[PDB]
């Protein structure tokens, strides 16, 4: 699709699409950039993540609206339309997972890139789990857990406890535990331990890094306040 466009042009257009709030375009541009086969820089990884987060975020919000209407009703139209949105959402998740598997993760050697992509893998399996029903749900849940766990193991070995990627991974894994895995106690323990270990490391940071880390720490605290 994007095979005729220069990598640098795809990246430039992804940034313009973000400014224009054209997130479907942004995701297509970044998919094209990934398919050029080169590794992604830190900024380019962020563009890929922002693009697909916005696309799947719109789909998840629509699926929740339709699922709530469908549950209140219980013609075929509400179910049929919820199913259509769900299939589209699953297709976006499968596209992202496919990019990670071909071949972003296998080429990611540095902790910052590998943790970033594995967190993404856990997130997109988590979005699949939100709409899955039955034993399909079990294997999807295990795939999310496995990706998050590998990312956690790397992050604890290779990054300081204030690193924003490490903090966001722990935040999202804690949400996985609470909302997906029916493990609220594990969610609370992870959020508390992550927060406390980051607090103890803030003294090492510059003013700008302090702002980055404390922003995410506040998200951990917000969840803990809602969960306790």
């Amino acid at each position: 699709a994007m095979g005729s466009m220069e990598r640098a042009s795809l990246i430039q257009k992804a940034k313009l699409a973000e400014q224009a709030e054209r997130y479907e375009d942004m995701a297509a541009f970044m998919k094209g950039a990934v398919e050029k086969g080169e590794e992604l820089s830190c900024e380019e990884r962020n563009l890929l993540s922002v693009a697909y987060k916005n696309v799947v975020g719109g789909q998840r919000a629509a699926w929740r609206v339709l699922s709530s209407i469908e549950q209140k009703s219980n013609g075929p139209e509400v179910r049929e339309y919820r199913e259509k949105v769900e299939t589209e959402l699953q297709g976006v998740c499968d596209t992202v997972l496919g990019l990670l598997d071909s071949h972003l993760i296998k080429e990611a050697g540095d902790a910052e890139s590998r943790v970033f992509y594995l967190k993404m893998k856990g997130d997109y399996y988590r979005y699949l789990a939100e709409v899955a029903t039955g034993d399909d749900k079990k294997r999807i849940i295990d795939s999310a857990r496995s990706a998050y766990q590998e990312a956690m193991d790397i992050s604890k070995k290779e990054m300081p406890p204030t690193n924003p990627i490490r903090l966001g991974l722990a935040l999202n894994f804690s949400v996985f535990h609470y909302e997906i895995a029916n493990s609220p106690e594990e969610a609370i323990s992870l959020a508390k331990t992550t927060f406390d270990e980051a607090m103890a490391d803030l003294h090492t940071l510059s003013e700008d890094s302090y702002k980055d880390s404390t922003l995410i720490m506040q998200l951990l605290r917000d969840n803990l306040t809602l969960w306790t």
Binding site: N46, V50, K53, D123, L171, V175, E179, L219, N223
Partner: peptide, 9 residues
């Protein structure tokens, strides 16, 4: 609750 919002770069 809330995951990383992650929609702005």
């Amino acid at each position: 609750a809330g995951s990383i919002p992650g929609r702005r770069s």
